[PDB]
Amino acid sequence: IVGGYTCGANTVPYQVSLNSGYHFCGGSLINSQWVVSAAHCYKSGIQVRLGEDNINVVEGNEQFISASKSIVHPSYNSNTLNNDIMLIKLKSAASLNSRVASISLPTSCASAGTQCLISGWGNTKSSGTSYPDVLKCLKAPILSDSSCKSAYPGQITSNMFCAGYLEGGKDSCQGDSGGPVVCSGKLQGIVSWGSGCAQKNKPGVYTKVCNYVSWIKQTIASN
Numbered sequence: 001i002v003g004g005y006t007c008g009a010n011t012v013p014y015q016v017s018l019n020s021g022y023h024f025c026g027g028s029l030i031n032s033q034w035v036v037s038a039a040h041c042y043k044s045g046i047q048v049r050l051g052e053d054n055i056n057v058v059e060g061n062e063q064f065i066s067a068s069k070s071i072v073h074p075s076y077n078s079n080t081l082n083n084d085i086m087l088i089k090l091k092s093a094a095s096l097n098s099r100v101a102s103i104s105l106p107t108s109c110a111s112a113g114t115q116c117l118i119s120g121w122g123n124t125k126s127s128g129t130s131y132p133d134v135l136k137c138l139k140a141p142i143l144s145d146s147s148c149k150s151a152y153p154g155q156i157t158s159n160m161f162c163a164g165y166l167e168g169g170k171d172s173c174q175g176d177s178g179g180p181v182v183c184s185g186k187l188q189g190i191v192s193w194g195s196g197c198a199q200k201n202k203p204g205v206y207t208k209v210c211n212y213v214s215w216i217k218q219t220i221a222s223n
């Protein structure tokens, strides 16, 4: 997260860190046994780390659970990143409490101007790499579809939306991929891609979760 602030320990209880010997992507807990992340964060050997604040220190509240299976959307296109969503089933259910809690899926899509909270342990520098130890947060609005398409002509599908600042300086970045974009208490986006990080007129692009709620429910119900 570039231009964001320190969230504060456990203030984002649905945030998870996907780990393979190091943090490589974020994710959101939607119930005690399932996490939603981005398809491009897929790899085998994933350990889901819940209740984290400093990812390099065991401070208490952490729950480390191995992934039992990861389900990448069947129509995921790695070249366009269209359908960039993945579900991860945990080997055992997590213990939910005030520090580890799930976030609700939306019933309707959000409108442009909606203010959302984006969080993650991704890079904090737009020109260079500085990875933080604690969770960073950023409040960012959803942009209109015309501004989004004007910024990325021919690359925005109906399963994506832009959120951020066109002046540059505040944005999600590598390492934040897979994490949550929460607006009014509902998970509306998943950190997916963008051109560089925090560059002027190149806002972040997010997977539009409201388009996948029936797919997530049906897939969870059959697995």
Ligand SMILES: Cc1cc(Br)c([O-])c(-c2nc3cc(C(N)=[NH2+])ccc3[nH]2)c1
Pocket: 040, 171, 172, 173, 174, 175, 176, 177, 191, 192, 193, 194, 195, 196, 197, 198, 203, 204, 205
């Ligand atoms: C080299 C590399 C590898 C991976 Br895997 C990423 O997810 C990314 C990446 N760049 C990103 C840029 C943004 C942004 N909002 N500007 C968001 C997620 C990103 N993820 C970059």
Ligand SMILES: [Ca+2]
Pocket: 052, 053, 054, 055, 056, 057, 058, 059, 060, 062
């Ligand atoms: Ca820790």
Ligand SMILES: [Cl-]
Pocket: 149, 153, 154, 155
């Ligand atoms: Cl277009």
